[PDB]
Ligand binder design. Structure first.
Ligand SMILES: [Mg+2]
Ligand SMILES: [Mg+2]
Ligand SMILES: [Mg+2]
Lengths: 243, 237
């Protein structure tokens, strides 16, 4: 009967803040992914505090971890209602001419293939939900339209990988949206920081805390319907972002 | 002296019609890339006929091949005026649900990192041109805007990789348009995605004539950072 969430990237930043906010609800079950859950002590403490969180092993783009978690979720809950992809990487200061191809591949693997692997391994569980949702936390930095509307931040590997994941989610919405009643969408969380902030400062960057971003994102997730949200690029502030 | 073109995928999709059209112009020198020049007999026949085409080895995303070609071009010509990235891969029947990650990586490596590697290795030569141009070919499948209403051809690895390269080209235009006056853009030849990579292929000759019109007229303020159809209009990202 519980609403079932699977949240990747749940040890840090927006993934942790989403897990913490949702864990305060009455009838939910949250599988919170960590590369190494036994050492994810704040996730263990949230599990103790709420009883709504199961910390689980989930490395980005690792097909074995994703398949194992789907097996666990199948046994424990039998469905997934919200699949929330929040395990990202954004390496600073990667100018296009002096950055090796491997850095581009690494961002593609985590930011594009990570969500791909989650959707592929969890699709059957999403089909068991009456109203399945798949939200990938992307970035306005992945908007190609915004490239000519924003200054260069030396973040091409990141932006490229987010443009790629945005295209992937559009393909998922087209294929499965109507068939399964699935809302598949990407969401810009804002510029997230806590002091975390020296990272955005070292990037060259309107700041919102992870908790404030999570509060806005869950409102979008809760209200989403296919006709208004399926296949869209949403922002935490309610607006739509061009691709 | 001659306007220098470097064309990856010169035997694939629109690349051959493009190489053939440009090769019949005055005062050009065309380095026409192929994965295996020994296998590209019609390209050798064009080089025999025009005297303006140099067939060269260029495997996509191969840094050694691109660096070797750049050394060759620097010696013969000392500059590149037009870098035209037309190599690519578009494997059929790759639905999202069942296609392994390796296939997506393969398409990203060829279709996204191929053009990146070309740009990295030829950047210095482009800056020697009085009006450097860098164009990447794509199909409508790379437009994320078009996905929701377009027919699903099970070409997700291709489309994702082209959305990625479109973003890379926009980033290159933003930085190097301002720094070097580079015109960097993506063009849609009007071919289907599955024709984009067929060896020695709107017809190709009509598409090539339309594209060279865009290449010749390109200016940074009107073409830089854009996704252009062969017909002059813009395609949403
Ligand atoms: Mg409680
Ligand atoms: Mg693997
Ligand atoms: Mg002639």
């Amino acid at each position: 009967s519980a609403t079932v969430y699977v949240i990747s990237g749940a040890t840090r930043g927006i993934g942790f803040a989403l897990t913490s906010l949702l864990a305060q609800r009455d009838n939910v079950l949250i599988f919170a992914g960590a590369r190494d859950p036994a050492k994810a002590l704040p996730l263990q403490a949230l599990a103790a505090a709420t009883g709504k969180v199961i910390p689980v092993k989930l490395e980005s783009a690792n097909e074995e971890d994703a398949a194992a978690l789907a097996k666990l979720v199948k046994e424990k809950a039998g469905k997934v209602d919200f699949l929330l992809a929040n395990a990202g990487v954004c390496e600073l200061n990667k100018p296009v001419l002096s950055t090796p191809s491997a850095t581009f591949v690494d961002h593609f693997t985590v930011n594009t293939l990570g969500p791909l692997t989650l959707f592929q391994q969890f699709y059957s569980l999403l089909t068991e939900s009456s109203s399945p949702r798949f939200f990938v936390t992307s970035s306005a930095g992945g908007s190609t339209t915004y490239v000519s509307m924003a200054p260069d931040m030396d973040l091409a590997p990141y932006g490229i990988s987010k443009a790629a994941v945005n295209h992937l989610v559009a393909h998922i919405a087209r294929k499965f949206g109507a068939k399964d009643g699935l809302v598949a969408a990407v969401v810009h969380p804002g510029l997230v920081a806590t002091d975390t902030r020296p990272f955005l400062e070292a990037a060259g960057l309107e700041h919102i805390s992870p908790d404030e971003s999570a509060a806005a994102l869950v409102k979008i997730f809760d209200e989403a319907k296919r006709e208004t949200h399926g296949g869209k690029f949403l922002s935490y502030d309610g607006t739509e972002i061009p691709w």
